[PDB]
Design an enzyme around this catalytic site. Structure first.
Site, PDB file in Angstrom:
ATOM      1  N   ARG A  18     -14.376 -34.368 -22.813  1.00 38.90           N
ATOM      2  CA  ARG A  18     -14.656 -34.617 -21.394  1.00 38.90           C
ATOM      3  C   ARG A  18     -15.650 -33.343 -21.087  1.00 38.90           C
ATOM      4  NH1 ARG A  18     -11.327 -34.094 -16.134  1.00 38.90           N
ATOM      5  NH2 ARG A  18     -12.320 -31.759 -16.131  1.00 38.90           N
TER       6      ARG A  18
ATOM      7  N   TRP B 213     -12.601 -35.801  -2.930  1.00 40.06           N
ATOM      8  CA  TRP B 213     -12.668 -34.799  -3.804  1.00 40.06           C
ATOM      9  C   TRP B 213     -12.395 -35.509  -5.234  1.00 40.06           C
ATOM     10  CZ3 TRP B 213      -8.819 -32.850  -7.076  1.00 40.06           C
ATOM     11  CH2 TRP B 213      -8.965 -31.717  -7.837  1.00 40.06           C
TER      12      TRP B 213
ATOM     13  N   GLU C 245      -5.555 -42.310 -12.487  1.00 35.89           N
ATOM     14  CA  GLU C 245      -4.627 -40.982 -12.268  1.00 35.89           C
ATOM     15  C   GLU C 245      -4.036 -41.096 -10.952  1.00 35.89           C
ATOM     16  OE1 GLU C 245      -7.628 -38.412 -13.179  1.00 35.89           O
ATOM     17  OE2 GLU C 245      -7.273 -37.070 -11.349  1.00 35.89           O
TER      18      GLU C 245
ATOM     19  N   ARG D 145      -5.247 -45.034 -16.454  1.00 35.91           N
ATOM     20  CA  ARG D 145      -4.753 -43.410 -16.704  1.00 35.91           C
ATOM     21  C   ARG D 145      -3.595 -43.128 -15.851  1.00 35.91           C
ATOM     22  NH1 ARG D 145      -6.906 -39.482 -18.463  1.00 35.91           N
ATOM     23  NH2 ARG D 145      -7.661 -38.375 -16.723  1.00 35.91           N
TER      24      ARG D 145
ATOM     25  N   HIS E 223      -3.239 -39.655 -17.787  1.00 37.07           N
ATOM     26  CA  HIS E 223      -3.600 -38.403 -17.163  1.00 37.07           C
ATOM     27  C   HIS E 223      -2.814 -37.378 -17.900  1.00 37.07           C
ATOM     28  CE1 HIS E 223      -4.046 -36.082 -13.050  1.00 37.07           C
ATOM     29  NE2 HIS E 223      -5.168 -35.830 -13.886  1.00 37.07           N
TER      30      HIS E 223
ATOM     31  N   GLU F 164     -15.111 -42.048 -15.820  1.00 30.97           N
ATOM     32  CA  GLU F 164     -13.604 -42.390 -15.182  1.00 30.97           C
ATOM     33  C   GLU F 164     -13.652 -42.030 -13.485  1.00 30.97           C
ATOM     34  OE1 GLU F 164      -9.801 -38.850 -15.310  1.00 30.97           O
ATOM     35  OE2 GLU F 164     -11.203 -38.904 -16.581  1.00 30.97           O
TER      36      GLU F 164
ATOM     37  N   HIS G 138     -14.724 -38.596 -10.623  1.00 27.20           N
ATOM     38  CA  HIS G 138     -13.856 -37.975  -9.691  1.00 27.20           C
ATOM     39  C   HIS G 138     -14.051 -38.460  -8.396  1.00 27.20           C
ATOM     40  CE1 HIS G 138     -10.825 -34.928  -8.783  1.00 27.20           C
ATOM     41  NE2 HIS G 138     -10.417 -35.061 -10.075  1.00 27.20           N
TER      42      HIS G 138
ATOM     43  N   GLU H 298      -5.176 -37.099 -22.732  1.00 31.74           N
ATOM     44  CA  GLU H 298      -5.596 -36.050 -22.096  1.00 31.74           C
ATOM     45  C   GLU H 298      -4.986 -34.817 -22.389  1.00 31.74           C
ATOM     46  OE1 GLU H 298      -6.225 -36.388 -17.906  1.00 31.74           O
ATOM     47  OE2 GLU H 298      -7.296 -34.443 -17.908  1.00 31.74           O
TER      48      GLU H 298
ATOM     49  N   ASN I 200       1.266 -32.629  -7.695  1.00 32.49           N
ATOM     50  CA  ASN I 200       0.334 -31.364  -7.319  1.00 32.49           C
ATOM     51  C   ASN I 200      -0.145 -31.376  -5.819  1.00 32.49           C
ATOM     52  OD1 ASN I 200      -0.797 -29.071  -7.881  1.00 32.49           O
ATOM     53  ND2 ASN I 200      -2.743 -30.110  -9.008  1.00 32.49           N
TER      54      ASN I 200
ATOM     55  N   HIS J  30     -10.997 -30.510 -22.260  1.00 34.50           N
ATOM     56  CA  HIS J  30     -11.933 -30.557 -21.201  1.00 34.50           C
ATOM     57  C   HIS J  30     -12.981 -29.413 -21.607  1.00 34.50           C
ATOM     58  CE1 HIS J  30      -9.278 -32.003 -17.557  1.00 34.50           C
ATOM     59  NE2 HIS J  30      -9.196 -32.421 -18.516  1.00 34.50           N
TER      60      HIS J  30
ATOM     61  N   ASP K 217      -0.868 -29.982 -14.361  1.00 34.97           N
ATOM     62  CA  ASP K 217       0.062 -30.216 -13.366  1.00 34.97           C
ATOM     63  C   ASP K 217       1.076 -31.385 -13.351  1.00 34.97           C
ATOM     64  OD1 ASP K 217      -2.839 -31.301 -12.376  1.00 34.97           O
ATOM     65  OD2 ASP K 217      -1.332 -32.771 -11.424  1.00 34.97           O
TER      66      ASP K 217
ATOM     67  N   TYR L 276     -16.611 -30.757  -9.302  1.00 36.52           N
ATOM     68  CA  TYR L 276     -15.388 -30.996 -10.220  1.00 36.52           C
ATOM     69  C   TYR L 276     -15.378 -30.478 -11.577  1.00 36.52           C
ATOM     70  CZ  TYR L 276     -11.396 -32.874 -12.729  1.00 36.52           C
ATOM     71  OH  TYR L 276     -10.398 -32.818 -13.382  1.00 36.52           O
TER      72      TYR L 276
ATOM     73  N   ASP M 130     -15.934 -37.495 -16.004  1.00 35.18           N
ATOM     74  CA  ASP M 130     -15.127 -37.775 -14.731  1.00 35.18           C
ATOM     75  C   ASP M 130     -15.802 -37.727 -13.635  1.00 35.18           C
ATOM     76  OD1 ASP M 130     -13.085 -38.191 -12.976  1.00 35.18           O
ATOM     77  OD2 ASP M 130     -11.662 -36.439 -13.923  1.00 35.18           O
TER      78      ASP M 130
END
Ligand code: CL
Ligand code: MG
Ligand code: MG
Lengths: 384, 395
Positions: free
Chosen positions: B148, B395, B255, B276, B305, B229, B205, B332, B38, B123, B309, B160, B203
């Site tokens: 999640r 991010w 991930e 992940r 993960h 996570e 993130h 997931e 991605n 999600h 994507d 996120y 998450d």
């Protein structure tokens, strides 16, 4: 500082493939950075062309640190050879621009000179031990104070080589003994194991070559697992060098902090540029580890010029590998670094002192070329 | 084993970008592998097109292991997201071929089924906690046993759903302290409305430092999260130590990894509970079997993960993998668009919150090249995150 007006890659093959990134500011000042990843060149070219370059347009070129973090963290998928080479190219070009803005050669911007000249080593290779000794003599005459020695072991797409560890382990010490017999003690003598041993095998080799006092034994073992160095370090006092295949401080932080190596080999182009390599050099310095930048022909004169500047400033400089580029390559990348009596002298021009002749570069189209692979005698795909 | 007669990439954007490698043997049998990275898609496309594909022609397609080592060791420059994604694409395609040759669905080739269904999580997101709770309710009704949960942070504009949402990276702003003070309220609310049975995942993130994640983990212990996570960036694997020593909230990471060497120490030190790293980015079936096996020695379970994507090719292969692997944790589930599903016909099924592996030989996924050609590539980059003072953050 001024905004980036344009940025683009140049691909050229004046004897071999090189990828270069050029950044041009609104004032017309420009900088270049090496982006060459031997045998995977177009991966980096595309990473830059499609994903990085467009994001550079309009950015403040003075923001070197922010840009480095932006590309490193912003990629989301962090580290890796394609990734960190793309980042290095941008970083090198921005340092070039900053030094030009400052009106200083790059070494001055970094903290000024720590030494008057930069010691190199030359590659001396022969099929036989005698052939190798001949090469050493010819390079010593040129003023090289250090040589990397290799000789044959008796017994577009990747070439396939065959390898025998035990034949090599039984033969290698004979080369170093012959080098010392012919040249004596003063000469620095380096050797590259090129990833082919297991740790206890490298420990055996290290011990066997102790009487020959090598400057370093390089890349004994594949080191994705950094613990791979431990048995070697515990069993020999032959100095160790590693890291040309690394791209991140995270590939070597443990090697350094545990004092498992004496020289770190990761170069500017593949290790995330000046910004990242300063941090690696500084970490190394805490543990007596010195720099020994990889400097094959497949890093361009842009990297070499920047490397010589870096080498000139960095306190814990060890040595600079020198594999001379072809005349054609030197013509495509005019530069002001000089080679004299076995040493480099940094240029005095503002920037890293290297340029690219785009018109001449266009005369040499890319030609695909791959690194070889190595197989054992039974056919096992091994480390080249 | 037959030789590879042809190999090539297919690029398509049926809602978002996917890159696929197709390998065709002398007999006409083919296999496909996901090559999607991605936001850097064309780097992998070029890695494959210019450097790997030409070397695949004429190779014995049955030699999966040899090909893996040839590409991994032979590259000289080892590991990395572009590198390992290219290798995973080849590996996935070759396992596809081998399973077809064996006349078996992939899970049978790996050692047979260890379970009758593959539990997923959905999600659940909303601007307010209440919005999020509405989504939990909606997914629980669809039969999801796990969710999640993410919600907006007061005083923060963006936190996120297709994150790669712009040609160039979008710029989000972040405040760690506002997040830390708020997040526990979300989990408290989820438990209040839904009770204890539901698996609840979160998450982080990458946005916290270790001692901050330690604080969060402790604060959320009463809510018994399935996992917390990506607490902290983990290039330095030691970053997990402080978190693990300070909380019993289970931890998941990986991930963004592509090598067993990114997580060997995390696993051996028992610093995480779920790994992940997925097939597409983790060097394929060949590599991920080894990662899963190392993990099992330390009670670590798989938590692949599974975002949009990664293409249906990866998902199908992941479901086969999930069906066999003893130490499976969870899968997931971010549903692909209808167009994506049409471009990659497949035989995995989703029923009552779980995946069921396909029974057709191969990993059960194909690509309709004529349809794929109808959806042209469109560059999309992942966003960046900056702190309130402008600092480029994670991010
Ligand atoms: Cl990479
Ligand atoms: Mg070397
Ligand atoms: Mg995540």
């Amino acid at each position: 500082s001024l905004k980036i007006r344009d940025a683009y890659t140049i691909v050229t093959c004046p004897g071999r493939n090189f990828v270069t990134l050029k950044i041009v500011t609104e004032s017309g000042t420009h900088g270049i950075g090496d982006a060459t990843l031997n045998g995977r060149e177009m991966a980096v070219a595309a990473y830059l062309d499609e994903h990085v370059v467009p994001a550079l347009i309009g950015r403040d070129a003075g923001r070197i640190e922010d840009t480095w973090q932006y590309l490193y963290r912003g990629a989301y998928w962090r580290r890796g050879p394609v990734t960190m080479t793309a980042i290095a190219a941008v970083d090198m070009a921005l340092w070039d621009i900053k030094a030009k803005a400052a009106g200083m050669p790059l070494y001055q911007l970094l903290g000024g000179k720590s030494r008057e000249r930069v010691m190199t080593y030359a590659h001396c290779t022969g099929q036989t031990i005698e052939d190798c000794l001949g090469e050493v003599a010819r390079h010593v005459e040129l003023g090289y104070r250090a040589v990397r020695v290799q000789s044959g072991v008796p017994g577009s797409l990747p070439a396939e080589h065959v390898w025998s560890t035990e034949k090599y382990l039984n033969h290698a010490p004979k080369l170093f003994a012959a080098v010392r017999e012919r040249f004596g003690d003063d000469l620095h003598v380096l050797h590259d194991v090129h990833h082919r041993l297991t740790p206890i095998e490298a420990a055996r080799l290290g011990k066997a070559v102790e009487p020959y006092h090598l400057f370093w034994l390089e890349d004994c073992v594949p080191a994705e697992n950094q613990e791979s160095l431990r048995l070697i370090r515990e069993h020999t006092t032959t100095p160790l060098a590693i890291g040309e295949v690394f791209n991140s401080i995270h590939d070597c932080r443990e090697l350094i902090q545990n004092q498992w190596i004496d020289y770190i080999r990761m170069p500017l182009t593949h290790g995330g540029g000046i910004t990242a390599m300063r941090r690696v050099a500084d970490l190394a310095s805490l543990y007596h580890v010195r720099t020994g930048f990889h400097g094959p022909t497949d890093l361009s004169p842009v990297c070499l010029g920047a490397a010589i500047h870096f080498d000139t400033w960095v306190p814990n400089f060890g040595i600079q590998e020198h594999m001379p580029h072809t005349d054609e390559t030197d013509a495509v990348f005019p530069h002001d670094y000089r080679f004299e009596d076995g040493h480099f002298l940094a240029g005095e021009s503002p920037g890293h002192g290297v340029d690219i002749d785009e018109e001449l570069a266009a005369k040499y189209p890319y030609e695909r070329a791959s690194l070889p692979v190595n197989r054992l005698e039974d056919g096992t795909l091994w480390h080249w």
